[PDB]
Design a protein around this nucleic acid. Structure first.
Ligand SMILES: [Mg+2]
Ligand SMILES: [Mg+2]
Lengths: 292, 191, 111, 38, 130
RNA sequence: GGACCUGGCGGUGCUUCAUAUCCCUCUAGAGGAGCCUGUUCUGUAAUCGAUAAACCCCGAUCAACCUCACCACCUCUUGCUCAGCCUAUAUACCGCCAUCUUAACCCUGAUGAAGGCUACAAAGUACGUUAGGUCAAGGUGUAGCCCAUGAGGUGGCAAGAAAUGGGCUACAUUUUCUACCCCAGAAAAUUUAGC
């Protein structure tokens, strides 16, 4: 257990160490920031340990120490909160506020806050059923015609689902010396590695290692694989492709070229079409390779 | 006894505290640095007694101020690149031959490395005064050592133990190749 | 910490280039490490709080050891001098010691 | 070596020089440089 | 030292010889290590020294190599790279820079310095023998 | 002897479902041919034996007059070096595999044994074992023999039957040969594994 005196001292040592590190790096201590602390500690004490928390850290003692101690009543003994004797003053105060807003309204991409972090916000342990009751009240408040104060109040209790997998990197459009717009991309299948350049305008000519695609790929299966990207988005005969493939075999080279052309063609199509290609599996590297 | 970090001022000359590469000394480093995967409801371990901080190759003896203050004193040992050689275009004009040699720095009692003897001479045939027959003969004689795309002849010598001996061997090989390319045998008449 | 944290949470006690790709004499370095650890643990019996750190830069050989405060400082100085000279004439390289005394074993957790 | 070669001309973890058990013991402790188990 | 300072210091003796200095077109320093953070810190150190000594430096990262071997119990070794190409530096500048950065080579990191000296054709090869 | 409380039932059957291992489902073999072979039986005075140790001379392959083992005759010895021995012992120990055994508090019942939950909430909160195998990728000891468990000479030792298990070869029309590296021309039931 960490006494408040202990945390006070550690704050002092952190401040003096911050000025010391600022002196060592030559930066001005007055404007020296926490990002500077992290960067300087990484430089002075290099560590490639994969666990980021196992690497050297000099953070402000407030973030490190889990010491908490909240006083609920004064010297006279009177509790500060009017719901103290319930034992869950924070939770019931929140419920009271929500019910009052619901009364007022009656007179007139994201996820719900999970139980443990609701406890963290309230700094009070709570059960499953009361959490369900609170979530039901929040849903009821959403159902009503929530005004401003209501929906930022609800937004206090809604986290962000930052797992949007529609994050394909659209290659920038480049321009050749002739002024023609194009886009370059890479792809890999087994040991085959391909790099394709797709032109914005063309007549459907594909050149594989300087050779026509029907001559470089005698087998119809490879030609169908080269078709799949352009056909999926209804632009066969509307682009020119210049690709270079190396390594692997016939099927691996065809798959790598397909991936490269799809990733380069992402530039000239709409975001919806990019998502349709992604859901069709045209923009994912195949990770299946020979096993030892 | 108390650590000497307590006596260090906030405006000290840090390079004097760590003049050279030295291990992490928690009684000498005035930082409250912590490192270690914390336990449940715990904190990363403190520096005093931390073997993990002692295992890092710390760069405390190389700070930006220390680096500047060192390389400012080391300027006296340097010479100036000839300003006439502004780019590689004139480097390949005034100094045709390129000699590549490698040194290896490992850690141990022995400084020897078998790979330090290799020498690579690179010269563009266009820099050598060869007529049509001479260049044909030299190209056919060298074989794959000549790359047609780059017009460069690459002679790699590693037979001799030392490196000066291999450099001399490469020079002698180039000398013979040139002289024997500028020679026509009675045999060479009827190509 | 378990062995599967050697590159995640734990580190490497001995640090040398010999094991890298293309570098030679890995087995020689390992044999030197084995003897060096045995000789330190026998020259400082019950003193080392935790394992050594055997660093090597050029021909240098730094033993960054962590010991206790139980022996008298005179004995520590005598042992440092003896072991330094013995190892320097042992390996024909400039060996060095960096003893770090701690009040007691720095326990991390309990198993 | 030279003498025996002349007549002929006319005609386990040995990589690290450790016992196979010991190499596991050393490598688990992190003792070997760069030998991380994966 | 607030008052007690060395009054004068013995600067080392650097004599300007008469023999012409060597010229290096390129100098590739490939540093190999088991740790990426050490290589990044050493890259910062070397680059700062190169900028201050007037040397032209360019850094890149050659691909990492993996040695996997099974004794079942399976072990792995990582080799990460950082390549520093210095360009257009004379013999003395290159020698002093290399001495500095090799004396300050961190633990567990090896180096492979490739020097490409510029030389002239031998006088024997200027004209054919008659 | 009356009434009541806690049970345990090393519990017994059914009911409902979780119901994964394992079957069924899929793929390829194995049943044919020719060889070499492991085991078992019987045979001889003897051993059918073993080639980091023979022969070979496309690939392989049998004895080889080889050689160590064995049978029958013999010989050498203070000799190699206070000699020599591919002897025994884990039924000596470790090393390694396998067998088997194995807290407090607060309320309720009249302050009895005893009991304490309802969320639109009603008292509950805080190791041994083994005549075990393995001395072929490992060690430490302990005993044997020493005119013989050491060293040599002479000759001899050639094996047959089935019943079963495995291994090596070719086995094709979705084939084969040439040019090419894919638009050509000519020929002709049981049962073992895996996903
Ligand atoms: Mg036994
Ligand atoms: Mg027989």
């Amino acid at each position: 257990t960490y006494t408040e005196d202990f945390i006070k001292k550690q704050i002092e040592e952190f401040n003096i160490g911050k000025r010391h590190l600022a002196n060592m790096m030559g930066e001005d201590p007055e404007t020296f920031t926490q990002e500077d602390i992290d960067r300087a500690i990484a430089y002075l004490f290099p560590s490639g340990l994969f666990e980021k928390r196992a690497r050297p850290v000099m953070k402000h003692p407030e973030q490190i120490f889990p010491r908490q101690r909240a006083i609920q009543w004064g010297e006279d003994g009177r509790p500060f909160h009017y719901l103290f004797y319930t034992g869950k003053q924070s939770y019931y105060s929140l419920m009271h506020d929500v019910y009052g807003m619901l009364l007022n309204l009656e007179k007139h991409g994201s996820r719900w806050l999970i139980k443990e972090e609701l406890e963290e916000m309230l700094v009070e342990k709570l059960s499953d059923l009361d959490y369900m009751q609170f979530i039901r009240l929040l849903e009821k408040l959403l159902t009503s015609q929530c005004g401003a104060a209501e929906e930022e109040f609800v937004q206090r209790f809604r986290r962000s689902v930052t797992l949007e997998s529609k994050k394909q990197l659209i290659e920038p459009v480049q321009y050749d010396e002739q002024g023609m717009a194009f886009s370059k991309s890479e792809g890999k299948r087994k040991t085959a590695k391909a790099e394709a350049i797709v032109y914005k305008h063309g007549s459907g000519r594909i050149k594989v290692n300087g050779i026509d695609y029907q001559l470089y790929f005698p087998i119809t299966q490879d030609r169908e694989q080269l078709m799949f990207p352009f056909h999926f988005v209804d632009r066969l005969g509307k682009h020119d492709v210049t690709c270079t493939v190396s390594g692997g075999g016939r099927s691996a080279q065809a798959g790598a070229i397909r991936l490269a052309m799809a990733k380069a063609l992402c530039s000239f199509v709409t975001e919806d079409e990019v998502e349709w290609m992604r859901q069709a599996g045209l923009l994912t590297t195949d990770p299946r390779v020979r096993e030892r | 006894l108390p650590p000497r970090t307590e006596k260090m001022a906030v405006d000290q000359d840090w390079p004097s505290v760590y003049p050279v590469a030295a291990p992490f000394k928690p009684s000498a480093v005035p930082l409250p640095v912590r490192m270690g995967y914390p336990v449940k409801k715990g904190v990363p371990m403190a520096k005093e007694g931390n073997l993990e901080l002692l295992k890092i190759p710390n760069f405390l003896h190389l700070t930006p101020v220390a680096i500047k203050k060192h390389c400012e004193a080391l300027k006296d040992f340097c010479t100036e690149w000839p300003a006439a050689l502004d780019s590689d275009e004139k480097c390949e004009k005034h100094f045709p031959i390129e000699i590549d040699s490698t040194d290896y720095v490992s850690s141990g009692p022995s400084v020897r490395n078998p790979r330090a003897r290799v020498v690579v001479l690179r010269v563009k045939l266009s820099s050598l005064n060869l007529d049509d027959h001479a260049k044909k003969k030299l190209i056919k004689l060298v074989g794959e050592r000549y790359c047609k795309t780059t017009d460069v002849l690459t002679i790699k010598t590693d037979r001799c133990p030392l490196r000066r001996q291999n450099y001399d061997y490469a020079v002698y090989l180039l000398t013979v190749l040139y002289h024997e390319s500028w020679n026509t045998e009675e045999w060479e008449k009827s190509k | 910490h378990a062995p599967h944290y050697i590159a995640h949470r734990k580190g490497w006690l001995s640090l040398h280039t010999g094991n890298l790709d293309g570098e030679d004499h890995a087995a020689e370095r390992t044999v030197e490490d084995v003897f060096l650890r045995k000789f330190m643990w026998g020259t400082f019996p019950g003193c080392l709080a935790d394992q050594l750190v055997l660093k090597r830069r050029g021909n240098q050989l730094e033993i960054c050891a962590v010991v206790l405060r139980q022996l008298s400082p005179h004995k520590y100085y005598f042992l440092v001098g003896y072991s330094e000279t013995l190892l320097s004439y042992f390996y024909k390289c400039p060996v060095r010691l960096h003893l770090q005394t701690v009040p007691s074993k720095v326990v991390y957790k309990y198993l | 070596a030279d003498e025996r070669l002349r007549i002929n001309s006319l005609r386990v973890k040995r990589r690290w020089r450790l016992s196979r058990i010991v190499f596991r013991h050393l490598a688990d402790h992190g003792q070997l440089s760069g030998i991380q188990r994966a | 030292l607030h008052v007690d300072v060395p009054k004068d210091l013995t600067k080392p003796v650097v004599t300007i010889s008469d023999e012409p200095d060597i010229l290096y077109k390129r100098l590739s320093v490939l540093v190999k290590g088991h740790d990426k953070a050490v290589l990044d810190s050493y890259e910062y150190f070397a680059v700062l020294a190169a900028k201050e000594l007037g040397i032209s430096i360019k850094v890149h990262e050659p691909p990492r190599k993996i040695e996997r071997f099974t004794l079942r119990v399976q072990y792995e070794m990582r080799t990460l790279y950082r390549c520093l190409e210095l360009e257009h530096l004379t013999g003395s500048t290159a020698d002093v820079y290399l001495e500095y950065i090799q004396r300050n080579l961190p633990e567990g990191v090896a180096m492979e310095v490739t020097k490409t000296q510029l030389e002239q054709l031998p006088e024997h090869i200027k004209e054919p023998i008659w």
